[PDB]
Amino acid sequence: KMPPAVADAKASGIARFNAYTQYFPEATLITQPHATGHVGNFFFTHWKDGGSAALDLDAKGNFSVSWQGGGYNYVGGPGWHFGDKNRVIGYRFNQDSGASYITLYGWGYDKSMPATDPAHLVEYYILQRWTYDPSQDGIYGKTFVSNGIEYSTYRSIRKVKPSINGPTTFYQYWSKPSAQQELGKDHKIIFADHVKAWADTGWILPDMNNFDASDDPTYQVLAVEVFNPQKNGTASGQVWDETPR
Numbered sequence: 001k002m003p004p005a006v007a008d009a010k011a012s013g014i015a016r017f018n019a020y021t022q023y024f025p026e027a028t029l030i031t032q033p034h035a036t037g038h039v040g041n042f043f044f045t046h047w048k049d050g051g052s053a054a055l056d057l058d059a060k061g062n063f064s065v066s067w068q069g070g071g072y073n074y075v076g077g078p079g080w081h082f083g084d085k086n087r088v089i090g091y092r093f094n095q096d097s098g099a100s101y102i103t104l105y106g107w108g109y110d111k112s113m114p115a116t117d118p119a120h121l122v123e124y125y126i127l128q129r130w131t132y133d134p135s136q137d138g139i140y141g142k143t144f145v146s147n148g149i150e151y152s153t154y155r156s157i158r159k160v161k162p163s164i165n166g167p168t169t170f171y172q173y174w175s176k177p178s179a180q181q182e183l184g185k186d187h188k189i190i191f192a193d194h195v196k197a198w199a200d201t202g203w204i205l206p207d208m209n210n211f212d213a214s215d216d217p218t219y220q221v222l223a224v225e226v227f228n229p230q231k232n233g234t235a236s237g238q239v240w241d242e243t244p245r
Contacts, residue, residue, distance in 0.1 A: 001023035001025075001038070002023070002025065003023075003038075003040060003041040005041060005081075006023050006038045006041060009038070009043075009081050009217070010023070012211060013211060014081060014211060014217060017036065017211075017215060017216060017217070018215065019034050019035055019036045019045075019047075019215065019216065020035075020036045020037060021035050021036065021037035022037055022038075023037065023038040023039075024037065024038065024039045024040075024059075025040065025059065026039075026058070026059060027039065027056070027057065027058035027059065028056075028057060028058075029054060029055070029056045030044070030046045030054060030055040030056075030057065030076075031052070031054045032046075033047070033048060033049075033050075034046065034047045034048075035047075036216060036217075036219075038081075039057045039058060039059050039078070040058070040059025040060065040061075041059070042057065042059065042061050042078040042079065042080075042239070043078065043079055043080050043081040043217075043219055043221065044057055044076065044077065044078045044079075044221065045075070045076055045077070045216065045219060045221055045223075046076035047074070047075050047076055048067075048072055048073065048074045048076075049072055049073050050070070050072040051067065051068035051069075051070055051072035051074075052066070052067075052068045053065070053066060053067040053068060053072060053074040053076075053226070054066050055076045055077070055078075057078050060238070061078055061238050061239045061240050062236075062237075062238045063077065063078050063236065063237065063238065063239070064234060064235070064236035064237075065077070065099075065224040065234065065235050065236070066232070066233070066234045067099075067224075067226045067229055067232060067233050067234075068229070068232050069229055069230055069231045069232050070229075071228045071229065071230070072229070073226060073227050073228065074224070074225070074226040074229075075105070075223055075224075075225045075226075076221075076223060076224060077105070077221045077222045077223035077224055077239070078221055078222060078239050079104075079106075079219065079220050079221030079222050079239055080219065080220050080221070081217040081219050082208060082209040082210075082217060082218055082219065082220065083106045083107070083108065083191075083205075083208030083209065083218055083219070083220040084191070084208070084209075084220070084243075085191065085192055085195050085205075085208070086191070086192050086243065087191045087192075087220070087241070087243050088188060088189065088190050088191065088241070088242035088243045088244070089104060089188070089189040089191065089220075089222065089239065089240075089241070089242060090186060090187070090188055090189075090239070090240045090241070090242035091128075091186070091187055091189070091222050091237060091238065091239045091240070092183075092184070092185060092186045092187065092237050092238055093129070093183050093184075093235060093236065093237035094183060094184055094236055094237055095183065095234060095235060095236045095237075096129060096183060096233075096235040097231075097232075097233030097234050097235065098131050098233055099129065099130075099131070099224045099225060099226050099233065099235050100130065100131060100132040100134070100225050100226050100227045100229075101125075101127055101128075101129065101130035101131070101132060101134055101225050102127075102128050102129040102130070102222075102223070102224055102225070102235065103125045103126060103127045103128055103130075103222075103223055103225065104124075104125065104126035104128070104189050104191070104220065104221075104222060104223070105123075105124075105125055105220070105221055105222070105223035105225070106123075106124055106208065106218070106219055106220030106221065107121070107122065107123055107124070107163075107164050107208070107213070107216070107218045107219060107220075108121070108122045108124070108205040108206035108207055108208045108218055109121045109122075109164065109165060109206055109207060109210065109212060109213045109218050110206035110207045111210075111212040113206065115168060115169075116169075118157055118169050118170050118171045119171055119203075119204065119206065120170070120206055121163060121164075121165055121168060121170035121171075121206060121213075122170060122171050122172070122173055122205055122206055123158070123163065123170065123171075123172045123173075124172070124173040124174075124198075124205065125172065125173065125174045125175065126151075126175045126189050126191070126194055127174065127175065127176045127177065128177065128180075128181040128187065128189075129180050129181055130176075130180070132227060133176075134174070134225070135154040135156065135174040135176055137156045138154030138155055138156035138172065138174055139154060139155050139156070140152065140153070140154055141153035141154060141155060141197070141198070141200075141201040141203065142197060142200055142201055144193070144197045144200075146190050146193035146194065146197075147188050147189075147190055147193075149177050149178070149179075149181075150177065150178040151175045151176060151177050151178070151194070151197065152175070152176055152178075153173070153174060153175050153176075153194075153197050153198055153201065153203070154173075154174040154175075154176065155171055155172065155173055155174070155198075155203055156171070156172040156174070157169070157170075157171060157172075158170055158171075158172060163213075164213040164214065164215050164216040164217075164218070165213040165214045165215070166214045166215065171203070173198050173203055173205070175194045175197065175198075188242055191220075208220070221239075222237075222239040
């Protein structure tokens, strides 16, 4: 549409994805079961299997996520419709009732690779806050420091499970810090450090800039994830681009 990267995504056909809604020039409240779209220059993904969970997002990247009790799962947040190995992501959370985890969240997908190789499709996470450890099914890779924070890497396998390319078998890459990242303070994710840490143990990311998958672009967002919540909650903050010239 009007922001140049949104124009490009539109011209490349992002709207053919079933979940894609539209470009919103002003703040938008997303309440339907599953939606992607753009608010300003910010891509978003939003998905719940039920309940009132909602994403309120403006064109400055400010956002708030609410979720309902009753066990309904939620994953959603704002960012970019493509991943960039050299992106530096800035964010803060001012409030977090206790989401299952808060994380950079994205996908790579290489249609030229055999689908029987789980490395053809990767769901990746840079965890920042958590009350549930989603890497608990993963194998340990290595420990390293990025932006003065110690992280450890993990890789898990998902067998015939949902994905941006439909039900299939694929790898998840994780990076988990030694401490919860504090509320009320700006943080920075130097994505290239985590890409390198994964490559150091031979865990390579497939293509992060394509619309080849069935259901979604190979997006990269700052996501609030909530699984089987016993109480309602909210998490609010902001995301932005810290990548230097």
